[PDB]
C-alpha cells in the first residue's frame, strides 16, 4: 500500500505541550481537523505522564497521533504497546532549548532548537501546514519547512527531520 | 502541488549539472554483495563510484576529508556510504570518535562552497551497538541526509544471515524508481520494505528541496 490510510472516522489527537507558537500550531492542526488539547506548566514529568495515558487509548478510529512539545517516552507508541496505532503515522514536533533516537516504524520527529510572531521553525511549519498541509505529503511539506527557515533568516537552527514513515502521508 | 510551491528560492535541487557527483563506498572490514549492488545502482544513477576497502576507520574519515576539499562545482551532489559487516564487532582508537565527530564540518556551505546548496547524502550501515543521536551525532546542517541502519554484531541463525535488508531494498528501490521518484519517497519505500519483511532504516533529512536524479 502506497499511502497511509488517512480517511478514518477521526484524524487523531494533537497534544501540544508547552505563547504565540503554541497558538498557531493550534489554529493549523484544528484546520487539519485534529482535536487539539493544550498542556501548560511544562515539567518533564507531567508531559511523560500525560503521554503515557494518551498512548493508553483506543485509537482505532484515528488517522494518526501528533505530539508537540514547545520550549521557550517512546516505548508507549510502539505497535506492540500501542497496537491501535500500528502502521499509523505518529508525528513528533519538538522545539527544544542533544538527544538520542531509534527505532520504530511510522515514527517521525521534527526537531528544532530555539536560542513578535514566534520562532522560525513554528512560523514556517504553520505557514506551510496552513497553506499546503492538505495539498502536499508531510515529507516534502517539511522539506520546504527546512528551506524556508534556512532562507528567511537574513535581512541585514534548521529543523532536523528524521522519518521512519513506511508510506506517503497525505492530509486528505 | 509543487508545480506552485517554491520557497524564497526554488523547489527542486538543480540535478542537471555536468556530473552527478562522487560515490565513495567504504567497506568497514575486520578480521561485499551489498557493496557491489550499491556500486551498480549508483552507476546506473550516474555517479563516479570508487570503492574503498579499508579497516582503520581513520582511513575512511580522512579519505572523506580530502574529497570535501575537491571542487565539485560541476557536481549535482555527493554520496558517502559506510558499510559495516554483520556479526562481528570492531575496535577503534582514541581519536576516531572525535574524528567521526568532526567530519561533517568539512562539508558545510562555509567549509565546502562548491557544495553549498547541494545534497550531501550519507548512507551508514552500523552495528547494533553503535548509537545514533541528534556513535553517530546528527550534524544539523542544511542539505544533509543520513540514511542509517544497524547491522547485528553477533551470532546465530542458519541460512547464513543474508546481505542486509537495508541494502537489498535500497538497491531495489533506487534500482527501479531511482529515476521515477524523489529521494524521500524512495527512502520511504526502502523503509516500508525492510519493515514489511519481518533495525529499520532511520532517515534524517535537512534537505531544503526535492531531490530527484533527473
Curated annotation (Swiss-Prot), chain A:
Regulation of this protein's activity per its record: Zymogen activated by proteolytic cleavage; cleaved by the initiator caspase Dronc upon apoptosis induction.
Keyword Nucleus in annotation: no
Coiled-coil annotated spans: none
Keyword field contains Hydrolase: yes
Record note on what altering residue 97 to A does: No effect on binding to Diap2 but may affect stability of complex formed with Diap2
GO BP term, pick one: programmed cell death involved in cell development
Molecular functions per Gene Ontology: BIR domain binding; cysteine-type endopeptidase activity; ubiquitin protein ligase binding
Alphabetic keyword roster: Apoptosis, Hydrolase, Protease, Thiol protease, Zymogen
One GO location term (cellular component): cytoplasm
Domain of life: Eukaryota
EC number from the UniProt entry: 3.4.22.-
Active site: 72, 97
Residues in the signal sequence: none
Family of this protein: Belongs to the peptidase C14A family.
Role, per record: Involved in the activation cascade of caspases responsible for apoptosis execution. Acts downstream of rpr. Cleaves baculovirus p35 and lamin DmO in vitro.
Quaternary structure (record): Heterotetramer that consists of two anti-parallel arranged heterodimers, each one formed by a 21 kDa (p21) and a 12 kDa (p12) subunit. Inactive pro-form can homodimerize. Dronc and Drice can form a stable complex. Interacts with Diap2 (via BIR3 domain) to form a stable complex. May interact with some isoforms of Dark.
Protein name per Swiss-Prot or TrEMBL: Caspase drICE
Source organism per UniProt: Drosophila melanogaster
